[PDB]
Amino acid sequence: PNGLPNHIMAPVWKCLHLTKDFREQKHSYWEFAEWIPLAWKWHLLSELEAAPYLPQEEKSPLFSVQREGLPEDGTLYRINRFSSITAHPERWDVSFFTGGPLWALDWCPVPEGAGASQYVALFSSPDMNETHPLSQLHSGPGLLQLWGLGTLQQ
Amino acid sequence: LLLLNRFHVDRRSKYDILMEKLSVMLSTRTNHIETLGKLREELGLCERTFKRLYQYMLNAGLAKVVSLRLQEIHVMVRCLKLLKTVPPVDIVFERDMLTQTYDLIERRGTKGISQAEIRVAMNVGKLEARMLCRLLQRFKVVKGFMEDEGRQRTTKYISCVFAEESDLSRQYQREKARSELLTTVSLA
């Protein structure tokens, strides 16, 4: 029904069941019960304390998004560091700006069926122009970012 | 002469042993100097043999051409006097090897770089440096020029930013034009 041949889709449909059965067997609902977050170890830096860690670009490049089969919007968007455009009302894509070039990114895992709020953790390098030699330790200041995407239901 | 190690023997040469004898003689002369005739007479040598020894001793750097007056040995008397760059690239995380290789060639610029000097500077194998250059040629970001130096027709590579202005371009383009003139003014 999506227009691909059934022999092209048949492995995709097969993978759903195989993944669910694997996770039932070999994931779990709780581990590392010793390591619960303690608020007294989470010290909030003030604005003037945080400023050395923040990635250095304050506004994104200017951009525009064209979506196949829609009219041309034509506006250039730009968004502040730590800010996001609104999801497209029909296709739900979102762009957000992290202040520097992104070099690590992962989804927060949530047990299947939880329907939770979804998040990503990411690192964006401080300076667009930095590039770091592999042969040398660095140990500079940087920031790990957690971004919340919502529950992502229709 | 090729000898398999079992059978390796240090074969002497007639001139070598006679040069050593002359060296023993001259080094035992208090001045380290003697006239050619005496040096022959001490060994019974003909001039045809001895003149090789003299010039080999000179060419070996073991002795010097000198002449002394007869009153200095005791007329000028012929004698023999015995005497006896490119910095490597710290490969960065955030760029692919072609980007990093083009940057090296840009930092060279007008003077260019060879494939062998890319190989060392990038710290890659022979086959890996070769593929980098082949790709940068086909992507038309780098232009290759031949340079004869020593025994080797080495290629040098220059970015198309500097390629036309480069010395290798300018030198080659002149001699190409001059060649096309000379061959066309040669009679049909």
Swiss-Prot record, chain A:
Name-wise, this protein is: General transcription factor 3C polypeptide 2
Cellular location(s)? Nucleus
Taxonomic source organism: Homo sapiens (Human)
> Assembly and partners?
Part of the TFIIIC subcomplex TFIIIC2, consisting of six subunits, GTF3C1, GTF3C2, GTF3C3, GTF3C4, GTF3C5 and GTF3C6.
Coiled-coil stretches are none
The protein's job, in short, is: Required for RNA polymerase III-mediated transcription. Component of TFIIIC that initiates transcription complex assembly on tRNA and is required for transcription of 5S rRNA and other stable nuclear and cytoplasmic RNAs. May play a direct role in stabilizing interactions of TFIIIC2 with TFIIIC1.
Q: Where are the WD repeats?
A: 71-131
From Swiss-Prot, chain B:
| Subcellular location field | Nucleus
Which positions carry the signal peptide feature in this UniProt record? none
What is the documented function of this protein? Required for RNA polymerase III-mediated transcription. Component of TFIIIC that initiates transcription complex assembly on tRNA and is required for transcription of 5S rRNA and other stable nuclear and cytoplasmic RNAs. Binds to the box B promoter element.
Q: Which family does the record claim for this protein? A: Belongs to the TFIIIC subunit 1 family.
Q: Outline the subunit composition.
A: Part of the TFIIIC subcomplex TFIIIC2, consisting of six subunits, GTF3C1, GTF3C2, GTF3C3, GTF3C4, GTF3C5 and GTF3C6. Interacts with IGHMBP2. Interacts with MAF1.
Name listed for the protein in its UniProt record: General transcription factor 3C polypeptide 1
Report the source organism.
Homo sapiens (Human)
Q: Which gene encodes it?
A: GTF3C1
